[PDB]
Design a protein around this motif. Structure first.
Motif, PDB file in Angstrom:
ATOM      1  N   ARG A   4      -0.517   3.933  -1.042  1.00  0.00           N
ATOM      2  CA  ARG A   4      -1.850   4.276  -1.519  1.00  0.00           C
ATOM      3  C   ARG A   4      -2.724   4.781  -0.375  1.00  0.00           C
ATOM      4  O   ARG A   4      -3.161   5.932  -0.375  1.00  0.00           O
ATOM      5  CB  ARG A   4      -2.508   3.062  -2.178  1.00  0.00           C
ATOM      6  N   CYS A   5      -2.974   3.913   0.599  1.00  0.00           N
ATOM      7  CA  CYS A   5      -3.796   4.270   1.749  1.00  0.00           C
ATOM      8  C   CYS A   5      -3.175   5.428   2.524  1.00  0.00           C
ATOM      9  O   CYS A   5      -3.880   6.310   3.013  1.00  0.00           O
ATOM     10  CB  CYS A   5      -3.972   3.062   2.671  1.00  0.00           C
ATOM     11  N   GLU A   6      -1.849   5.418   2.630  1.00  0.00           N
ATOM     12  CA  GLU A   6      -1.132   6.468   3.345  1.00  0.00           C
ATOM     13  C   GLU A   6      -1.427   7.837   2.739  1.00  0.00           C
ATOM     14  O   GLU A   6      -1.743   8.789   3.453  1.00  0.00           O
ATOM     15  CB  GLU A   6       0.374   6.198   3.317  1.00  0.00           C
ATOM     16  N   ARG A   7      -1.319   7.929   1.418  1.00  0.00           N
ATOM     17  CA  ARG A   7      -1.571   9.181   0.716  1.00  0.00           C
ATOM     18  C   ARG A   7      -2.954   9.728   1.058  1.00  0.00           C
ATOM     19  O   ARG A   7      -3.096  10.891   1.434  1.00  0.00           O
ATOM     20  CB  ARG A   7      -1.452   8.976  -0.796  1.00  0.00           C
ATOM     21  N   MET A   8      -3.969   8.880   0.924  1.00  0.00           N
ATOM     22  CA  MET A   8      -5.340   9.279   1.220  1.00  0.00           C
ATOM     23  C   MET A   8      -5.523   9.530   2.714  1.00  0.00           C
ATOM     24  O   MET A   8      -6.407  10.283   3.123  1.00  0.00           O
ATOM     25  CB  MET A   8      -6.319   8.203   0.749  1.00  0.00           C
ATOM     26  N   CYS A   9      -4.682   8.895   3.524  1.00  0.00           N
ATOM     27  CA  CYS A   9      -4.750   9.049   4.971  1.00  0.00           C
ATOM     28  C   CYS A   9      -3.841  10.180   5.442  1.00  0.00           C
ATOM     29  O   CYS A   9      -3.573  10.318   6.635  1.00  0.00           O
ATOM     30  CB  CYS A   9      -4.358   7.741   5.663  1.00  0.00           C
ATOM     31  N   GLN A  10      -3.371  10.987   4.496  1.00  0.00           N
ATOM     32  CA  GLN A  10      -2.493  12.106   4.814  1.00  0.00           C
ATOM     33  C   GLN A  10      -3.161  13.061   5.797  1.00  0.00           C
ATOM     34  O   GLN A  10      -2.487  13.777   6.538  1.00  0.00           O
ATOM     35  CB  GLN A  10      -2.105  12.856   3.538  1.00  0.00           C
TER      36      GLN A  10
END
Length: 28
Positions: A4-10
């Motif tokens: 989740r956070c990773e996606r937004m932190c792409q």
């Protein structure tokens, strides 16, 4: 868990800048 956070932190991508992200996602 899901990236989740990773996606937004792409925006960061680089494992380096990802550090700050992982630290901020440690809140919840």
């Amino acid at each position: 868990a899901d990236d989740r956070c990773e996606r937004m932190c792409q925006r960061y991508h680089d494992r380096r800048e990802k550090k700050q992200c992982m630290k901020g996602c440690r809140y919840g």
